[PDB]
């Protein structure tokens, strides 16, 4: 075949988004979880299967304890990650990685060890001709088809912010904020408890993740919505648990995402996301700011909440000079923006020379990741 295709994998914590480069959507997207049988089984002709990976784990949740191998964009446990990748290639895609160059995503400002060790695995686990490790934000910017913008990247892992102008990139200006979907989830299960509902275990932690993925939304003004919580009508929603129990969540709903804008709720000093965006833009040269204000791109799973764009717009506009208009461009399909970006990058002809080649690695070692790529 010509070009051999190429493989693309986005692993921020939470989800693996994988598929062939050269396609508009990934084939396989499943949770990055390694569940292990915590309870000793007593039958015969079970499994045994030491552990389960991917949406298999979601299916068989109750038995397993689930461990997310990636936290804050850092891989805690490598064998687990390897297992997840194994599952992606063999269980879903059904590819021999020897037959494809593979692109990995990775978060900014992230420890060297992850990049280096990541590459070490790809070469000395799944024998592969070539690979590349790329910054998440840039990829989403490509996916949006814009050359310039400040990409607000918040996955389940961590939140990141990379201003870009006319390609280029500003290292000093790049900002990385420790908040995530996962931290919102931890907050949310906390806030439920004041209602009586107690979710103590990893299994049901994912149930609240599911709740947040739909029920929660961001206030266009927090205090107003909280005021109107007095007369509860629309702000309460019934949710059905798999157990059959019913949950009813009022104001607690929208204050969950509020945390992004008020990390004091979580107890961290680190400024809210909008202020971090200012922190990034303000670090940039005076000249370019005009378009960064106007070209803010949101990406990642934890920007999905309804109404986030609007709130960011209102806050940024409030803070900034009203001399210039602040457009925020947040597409739907943002969740997959990183992966799409990866697809487009591996599809690019010129890119086909920038790969880290197996050969190059074998001569020069794992450390070469930083040398060559950003």
């Amino acid at each position: 075949e010509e070009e051999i295709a190429a493989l693309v994998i986005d692993n921020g914590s939470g989800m693996c988004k994988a598929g062939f480069a050269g396609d508009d959507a990934p084939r396989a997207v499943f949770p990055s979880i390694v569940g292990r049988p915590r309870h000793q089984g007593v039958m015969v002709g079970m499994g045994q299967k030491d552990s389960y990976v991917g949406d298999e784990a979601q299916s068989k949740r109750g038995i397993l304890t689930l461990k997310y191998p990636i936290e804050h964009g850092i891989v805690t446990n490598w064998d687990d990650m390897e297992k997840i990748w194994h599952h992606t290639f063999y269980n879903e895609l059904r590819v021999a990685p020897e037959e494809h160059p593979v692109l990995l995503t990775e978060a900014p400002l992230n420890p060297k060890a992850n990049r280096e060790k990541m590459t070490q695995i790809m070469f000395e686990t799944f024998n592969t001709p070539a690979m590349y490790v790329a910054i998440q934000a840039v990829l989403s910017l490509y996916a949006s088809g814009r050359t310039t913008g400040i990409v607000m990247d918040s996955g389940d892992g961590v939140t990141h912010t990379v201003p870009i102008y006319e390609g280029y990139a500003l290292p000093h200006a790049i900002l990385r904020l420790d908040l995530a979907g996962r931290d919102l989830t931890d907050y949310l299960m906390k806030i439920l408890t004041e209602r009586g509902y107690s979710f103590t275990t990893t299994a049901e932690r994912e149930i609240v993740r599911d709740i947040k993925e739909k029920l929660c939304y961001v206030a266009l003004d927090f205090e107003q919505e909280m005021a109107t919580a007095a007369s509860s009508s629309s702000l309460e929603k019934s949710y059905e648990l798999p157990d059959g129990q019913v949950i009813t969540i009022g104001n607690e709903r929208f204050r969950c995402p509020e945390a992004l804008f008020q990390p004091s709720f979580l107890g961290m000093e680190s400024c809210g996301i909008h202020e971090t965006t200012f922190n990034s833009i303000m670090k940039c040269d005076v000249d370019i700011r005009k378009d960064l204000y106007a070209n803010t791109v949101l990406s990642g799973g934890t920007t999905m909440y309804p109404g986030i764009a609007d709130r960011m717009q209102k806050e940024i506009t409030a803070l900034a000079p009203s001399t210039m208009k602040i457009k925020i461009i947040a597409p739907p399909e943002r969740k997959y923006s990183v992966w799409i970006g990866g697809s487009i990058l591996a599809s690019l002809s010129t890119f086909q020379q920038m790969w880290i080649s197996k050969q190059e690695y074998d001569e020069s070692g794992p450390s070469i990741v930083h040398r060559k790529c950003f």
């Binding site: 039958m43 002709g45 045994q48 063999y90």
Partner: protein, 737 residues
């Protein structure tokens, strides 16, 4: 011949063609092909040595100093083009059907064969069967003749010729001519149209010819061990079930169809892949078969009864069990089909309906019902189908043997002739394929053992003590892989365990066997990309790939004792007489288990006796002589174990030459070693072997012979052609000058 080193090469028009090595280096040898004369490179391991012309067209392949598939293939090819069908390879007797009618099998030839050793005459069946007969009168112990599956080859037809020999030798009303008549019966019931062949025997046929101590025919009977009964229920993607089903469908007129209430092929669930025409016009064949039955002396009544149950097995398909909302048990809302069944048998519809759906079981001493799923009841239906068919087949064999008449019985001994389908390989290779392979495994093992005892006793006859491992053991780990129930459990055992355990999937099966038994060296998981087949094993023939789909379903054969009891109570004579029945009988009972048991019976029977071996090959699809397809012959050599036989004898000392022959023939080799003629012929060989510089591992000193390895005589022969070159030169020069 020049010392170019003519060495057989792999190629893909001729399986192995002759080519001159000349240029060599590492694996790559640039080689001159005898025919084309073009020079190309291939790895050297691939390329197998050639025997000198002295060996060309050898009677016995064991005699060749170079033993490899290439040499084998050449020898056989040579013989076949020459018009010679028969060759001996080691212990095997290899026949290749010319498809012509050959002048052979006269009276002079058979008389000519009598009382002689196999080497004494040219290769022939008459020889090996003479070996059997002589070993029986001589040894007073029973004998067995193994023919390995080949078509459609006319293996039976050949075996008629064996019987013809047997008649002429044993004397003192023609032969059982109805043996010819038997073929279409058992063929019709037993055989099916498959990918390899349009007619192939699923069931094994064991033909017993009974002999008194005098050596005369008391009579004969047929025995049929293995059957694939699962073929009736379930089939390959592009194949047909047994012939009788189809020939019944098209063949029976309204006269018979109206009684049987047969329908076209589309009506039946149990018939896969539709009609799958196949005709052949059919119908005519059915007509022939009825006469074939009749001459045998079965009444029209009996025939109609038989054909009725053959409908009955098919009818088991028309019954539909419908799962009920909420409850497990399911049920049969439509009485029509099972009503038809009840007409076709003695069963009351109601009785049968309760029995099937909610059977009663004896929990001693007081009976209790059972709840059965839809799936469970479906398997029971399929079981009774399959068991019914099997029972029917058994009864036919017994009733047939009644149609065969014997003189004064019980006297004294027999000669068994086994016709069974050989080791099979398809692209897909389902479950039945595995069972077949398993049986061919054991048969092969018996052959190895036999050969082993032959060689061990041959050594003593020549006075050479040598100890060497049982050849049978080679197959044993593969066999344990498939069979062994216990410590590590076998593939069949593990399948059974999968089948019974609650929510069993095919995937859980393969995973389980990998986890349980993957450490086995003959077991190989392909892994990664496809590799369509999900696991593979390494037989004698080679590596075969298996697809696990729907194996659990094929394995299930739970049998309701209640419905069985009802059959035992049937009103009609035929079926009730059939069901005239220890193990795990009831539920449990798996096809793999039954098959294993049946094979165990057969292996015991064969094991009791002294076997002899014949291997049949078809040259081509053409049905015409003068065309030998090397690839096909290679394939056949794989599945009949002949390759294994050569790789066995190589481990020992295949080439055996007498002292006298060795000296007289090869004396030219070493004028120095060979003295003035002390004679006695031992000393000669002592000298020859001594100066020729041969490892003591590579020969032994026997009473009448010297035993040699493969390739030792190849070297010595090269020293005879080198020596002859030296002498040709010295002679020609001397005459010239």
């Amino acid at each position: 011949w020049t010392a170019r080193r003519l060495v057989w090469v792999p190629s893909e028009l001729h399986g192995f063609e002759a080519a001159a090595l000349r240029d060599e280096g590492e694996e790559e040898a640039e080689v001159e092909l005898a025919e084309s004369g073009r020079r190309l490179r291939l790895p050297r391991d691939q390329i197998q040595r050639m025997n000198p012309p002295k060996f060309s067209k050898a009677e016995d392949m064991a005699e060749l100093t170079c033993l490899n598939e290439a040499s084998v293939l050449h020898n056989l090819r040579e013989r076949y083009y020459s018009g010679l069908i028969y060759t001996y390879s080691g212990l095997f007797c290899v026949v290749i059907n010319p498809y012509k009618q050959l002048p052979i099998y006269t009276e002079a030839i058979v008389e000519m064969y009598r009382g002689k050793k196999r080497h004494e005459v040219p290769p022939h069946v008459y020889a090996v069967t003479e070996g059997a007969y002589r070993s029986m009168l001589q040894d007073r112990e029973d004998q067995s003749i193994l023919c390995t599956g080949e078509s459609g080859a006319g293996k039976t037809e050949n075996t008629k010729k064996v019987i013809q020999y047997l008649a002429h030798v044993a004397s003192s009303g023609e032969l059982e001519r109805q043996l010819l008549q038997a073929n279409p019966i058992l063929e019709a019931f037993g055989n099916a149209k498959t990918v390899k062949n349009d007619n192939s025997s699923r069931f094994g046929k064991f033909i017993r010819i009974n002999f008194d101590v005098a050596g005369y025919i008391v009579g004969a009977n047929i025995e049929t061990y293995l059957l694939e009964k699962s073929r009736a229920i379930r089939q390959a993607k592009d194949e047909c079930s047994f012939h009788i089903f189809y020939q019944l469908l098209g063949g029976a007129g309204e006269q018979l169809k109206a009684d049987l209430l047969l329908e076209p092929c589309s009506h039946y669930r149990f018939l896969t892949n539709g009609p799958s025409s196949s005709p052949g016009q059919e119908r005519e064949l059915f007509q022939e078969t009825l006469e074939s039955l009749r001459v045998l002396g079965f009444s029209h009544e009996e025939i109609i009864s038989m054909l009725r149950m053959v409908s009955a097995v098919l009818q088991f398909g028309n019954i539909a069990l419908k799962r009920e909302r909420n409850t497990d048990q399911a049920t049969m809302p439509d009485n029509t089909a099972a009503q038809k069944l009840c007409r076709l048998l003695g069963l009351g519809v109601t009785d049968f309906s309760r029995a099937l759906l909610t059977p009663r079981i004896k929990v001693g001493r007081d009976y209790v019902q059972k709840a059965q799923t839809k799936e469970q009841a479906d398997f029971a239906l399929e079981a009774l189908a399959k068991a019914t068919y099997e029972r029917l087949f058994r009864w036919l064999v017994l009733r047939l043997n009644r149609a065969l008449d014997r003189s004064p019985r019980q006297g004294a001994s027999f000669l068994g002739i086994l016709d069974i389908a050989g080791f099979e390989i398809f692209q897909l290779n389902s479950f039945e394929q595995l069972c077949i392979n398993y049986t061919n495994e054991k048969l092969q093992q018996l052959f190895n053992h036999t050969m082993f005892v032959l060689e061990q006793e041959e050594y003593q006859r020549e006075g050479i003590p040598w100890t060497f491992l049982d050849f049978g053991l080679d197959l044993q780990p593969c066999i344990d892989l498939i069979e062994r129930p216990a410590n590590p459990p076998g593939l069949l055992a593990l399948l059974d365990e999968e089948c019974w355990f609650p929510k069993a999937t095919d995937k859980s099966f393969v995973e389980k066997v990998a986890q349980e038994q993957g450490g086995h060296p003959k077991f190989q998981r392909p892994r990664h990309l496809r590799d369509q087949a999900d696991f593979s094993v390494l037989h004698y023939a080679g590596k075969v790939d298996y697809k696990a789909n729907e194996w659990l379903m094929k394995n299930m054969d739970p049998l309701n004792d209640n419905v069985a009891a009802l059959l035992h109570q049937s009103t009609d004579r035929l079926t009730a007489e059939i069901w005239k029945d220890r193990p795990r009988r009831g539920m449990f009972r798996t096809v793999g288990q039954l098959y294993k048991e049946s094979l165990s019976r057969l292996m015991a029977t064969l094991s009791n006796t002294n076997p002899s071996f014949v291997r049949c090959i078809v040259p081509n699809h053409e049905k015409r002589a003068g065309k030998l397809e090397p690839r096909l012959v290679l394939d056949q050599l794989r599945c009949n174990g002949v390759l294994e036989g050569i790789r066995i004898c190589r481990q020992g000392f295949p080439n055996r030459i007498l002292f006298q022959e060795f000296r007289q023939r090869y004396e030219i080799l070493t004028p120095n070693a060979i003295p003035k003629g002390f004679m006695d012929g031992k000393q000669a060989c002592e000298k020859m072997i001594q100066a020729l510089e041969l490892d003591p591992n590579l020969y032994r000193v026997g009473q009448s012979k010297i035993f040699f390895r493969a390739g030792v005589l190849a070297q010595l022969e090269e020293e005879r052609a080198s020596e002859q070159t030296k002498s040709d030169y010295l002679k020609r020069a001397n005459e010239l000058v």
